[PDB]
């Protein structure tokens with residue numbers, strides 16, 4: 001069901017190695033809906049190549065645009081299981097401290113802060 005369940009550790013590592021080779025300036029991001037989530041839709045895909053210069057504030061804007069949300073729908077983004085201390089950090093920095101061992105950066109979204 002989840003990305004980690006669909007692909008072996010070996011497979012996730014090799015995909016990150018190919019994104020490095022073919023899209024060297026991009027951060028490999030996995031973005032999943034919270035399994036509890038009732039309100040927001042599911043994304044059209046799971047794996048995203050994010051330009052390494054955008055900060056987390058701009059990534060939230062990007063995902064809200066991809067979900068085609070309106071001004072008063074709530075959106076919370078967990079990175080590596082937890083709240084972001086700051087949305088102003090460049091995703092290149094966030095990646096280096098919050099990447100998984102497989103080399104993806106995992107994110108989950110919900111309409112409640114209580115996931």
Ligand SMILES: Cc1nn(C)c(C)c1NC(=O)CC#N
Nearest residue numbers: 013014016017018019020021
């Ligand atoms: C071929 C290889 N063997 N081992 C053991 C490692 C770390 C590698 N590196 C990559 O391929 C990284 C990338 N991209």
Ligand SMILES: [Cl-]
Nearest residue numbers: 023024025026
């Ligand atoms: Cl690139």
